[PDB]
Amino acid sequence: NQSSSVEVSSESYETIFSQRIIRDLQKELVVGALFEELPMSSK
Amino acid sequence: DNFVMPRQRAVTVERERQAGKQRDAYYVTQRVNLQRYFENGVVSGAYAA
Numbered sequence: 001n002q003s004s005s006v007e008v009s010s011e012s013y014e015t016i017f018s019q020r021i022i023r024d025l026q027k028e029l030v031v032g033a034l035f036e037e038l039p040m041s042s043k
Numbered sequence: 044d045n046f047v048m049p050r051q052r053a054v055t056v057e058r059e060r061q062a063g064k065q066r067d068a069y070y071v072t073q074r075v076n077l078q079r080y081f082e083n084g085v086v087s088g089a090y091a092a
Binding site for chain 2: 024
């Protein structure tokens with residue numbers, strides 16, 4: 001606040017730090033695993 | 044679901060008697076804002092020209 005008679009040391013003692021992690025929308029993956037597999041045991 | 048309501052204090056009413064003035068002042072205060080997590084998610088159409 002930095003206006004009254006008393007106050008705190010720095011803005012860090014006026015903030016709440018959250019561990020919560022957020023992410024936006026991610027493009028869907030479709031072609032990655034629609035074809036069936038062919039196991040190969042050689043070059 | 045991309046927007047939020049950061050609010051510190053709600054709507055509060057307060058009554059004070061300024062007897063030196065012979066009034067009854069009424070004060071209403073609140074603290075809110077409108078923010079969004081990410082910098083997208085809105086579209087608006089406008090008239091031509």
